[PDB]
Amino acid sequence: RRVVITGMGMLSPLGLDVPSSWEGILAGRSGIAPIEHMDLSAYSTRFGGSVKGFNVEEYLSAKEARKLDLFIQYGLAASFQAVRDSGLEVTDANRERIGVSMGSGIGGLTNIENNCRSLFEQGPRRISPFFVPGSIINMVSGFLSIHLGLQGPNYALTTAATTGTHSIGMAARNIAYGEADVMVAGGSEMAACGLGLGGFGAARALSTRNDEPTRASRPWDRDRDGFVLSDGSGALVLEELEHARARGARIYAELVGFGMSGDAFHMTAPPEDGAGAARCMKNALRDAGLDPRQVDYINAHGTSTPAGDIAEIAAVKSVFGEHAHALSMSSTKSMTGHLLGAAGAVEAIFSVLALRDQVAPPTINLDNPDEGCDLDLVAHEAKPRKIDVALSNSFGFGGTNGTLVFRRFA
Numbered sequence: 001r002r003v004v005i006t007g008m009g010m011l012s013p014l015g016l017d018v019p020s021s022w023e024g025i026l027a028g029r030s031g032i033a034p035i036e037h038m039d040l041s042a043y044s045t046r047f048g049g050s051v052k053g054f055n056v057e058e059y060l061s062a063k064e065a066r067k068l069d070l071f072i073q074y075g076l077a078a079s080f081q082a083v084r085d086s087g088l089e090v091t092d093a094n095r096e097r098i099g100v101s102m103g104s105g106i107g108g109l110t111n112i113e114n115n116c117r118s119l120f121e122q123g124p125r126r127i128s129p130f131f132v133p134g135s136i137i138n139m140v141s142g143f144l145s146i147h148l149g150l151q152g153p154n155y156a157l158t159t160a161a162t163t164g165t166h167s168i169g170m171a172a173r174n175i176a177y178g179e180a181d182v183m184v185a186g187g188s189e190m191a192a193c194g195l196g197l198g199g200f201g202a203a204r205a206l207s208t209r210n211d212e213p214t215r216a217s218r219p220w221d222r223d224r225d226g227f228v229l230s231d232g233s234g235a236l237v238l239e240e241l242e243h244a245r246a247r248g249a250r251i252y253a254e255l256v257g258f259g260m261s262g263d264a265f266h267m268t269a270p271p272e273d274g275a276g277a278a279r280c281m282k283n284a285l286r287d288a289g290l291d292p293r294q295v296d297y298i299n300a301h302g303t304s305t306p307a308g309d310i311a312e313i314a315a316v317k318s319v320f321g322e323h324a325h326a327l328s329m330s331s332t333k334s335m336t337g338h339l340l341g342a343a344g345a346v347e348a349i350f351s352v353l354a355l356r357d358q359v360a361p362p363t364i365n366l367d368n369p370d371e372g373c374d375l376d377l378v379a380h381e382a383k384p385r386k387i388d389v390a391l392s393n394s395f396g397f398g399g400t401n402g403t404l405v406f407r408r409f410a
């Protein structure tokens with residue numbers, strides 16, 4: 001059973017929908033700025049990718065919204081955009097065949113931090129009654145199903161940077177194997193609180209380029225110093241092909257492959273050859289029935305880390321051989337930063353749009369490619385080119401790897 005993309009939705013540091021975000025991507029625009037919503041003078045990193053000007057009231061009543069952490073509000077916004085974009089009418093004849101898989105890396109950290117402050121100052125009577133339902137990761141899937149009447153498979157992944165990739169891949173598996181005809185899948189993140197910036201800062205994971213936030217995210221650049229923490233959400237409507245065809249749906253692209261692997265190497269550090277990423281990409285290509293030479297575009301994991309970026313080049317060279325010099329690969333995290341559990345979702349949308357528009361997004365900030373970083377990394381400016389097959393990679397903490405493969409639809 002074939003799986004197509006019929007609807008997409010997004011909040012990112014570049015825009016409050018897909019068209020606005022993609023316009024930013026193609027123009028080489030950074031969404032990274034000093035963070036406004038808290039005082040970070042004690043933190044080593046004081047900048048990130050925030051969602052600008054979000055109005056939850058476009059999606060939910062002020063009543064419903066006050067009960068939900070920002071990561072849920074973001075996930076719901078993306079989901080509602082995707083469902084609307086799909087044109088699907090939910091009925092009694094199909095509602096059991098429509099499910100949801102929206103994940104998060106960290107979930108309701110802001111809500112946890114604020115409730116923790118009330119707990120320590122006052123005691124447990126100050127904890128919100130909506131604290132649990134409004135903070136737990138599966139409540140994007142939960143609330144979406146309730147609002148739209150979706151009675152199909154209902155779950156949530158939490159796999160760090162791989163969350164959105166795994167969410168989409170496993171949703172596509174549900175449709176492929178007949179457990180559902182439609183799935184809303186992707187991920188959401190809002191970890192820009194004291195615990196998030198302080199936590200990743202304590203692990204020395206973040207860029208500390210406070211003087212030039214728009215230059216901080218620089219995948220494959222010799223002066224990269226860690227990732228940029230970013231917020232938002234991505235959602236796709238995945239649909240069985242015959243189901244989509246029958247209702248006259250607009251098909252953006254086909255989801256042809258999903259691969260997974262584990263490094264089984266280290267908690268935060270990748271193998272220097274990227275062997276786990278290599279296995280993952282090969283698993284996805286095998287799943288899609290594609291040779292490496294059929295790949296035209298890779299949306300890289302490319303988080304702007306010393307070890308991670310070079311390991312991904314190594315894995316691409318291993319998988320693609322001489323064809324590694326013919327494909328284009330870029331990291332849109334150059335512009336968006338690292339959306340953690342949303343990264344795979346937004347990057348899947350950017351991969352589908354590279355197929356729609358026949359354009360490889362840039363890697364901005366790639367001033368001085370490091371040793372070995374000699375592929376077409378689409379430095380600086382978008383590249384019009386032929387793109388039949390687009391791959392999206394995500395490699396998360398714990399060495400958990402996921403690859404999606406999208407194809408132009410015939």
Ligand SMILES: CC(C)C[C@H](O)C(=O)NCC1(CNC(=O)c2cc[nH]n2)CCC1
Nearest residue numbers: 268269270274277305307308311312395
């Ligand atoms: C986090 C930092 C302090 C340490 C380190 O520099 C880093 O970036 N580790 C990244 C992980 C994700 N994996 C990859 O990037 C990757 C590339 C090729 N194959 N895997 C390994 C587990 C997280």
Ligand SMILES: [Cl-]
Nearest residue numbers: 265266267268
């Ligand atoms: Cl370890």
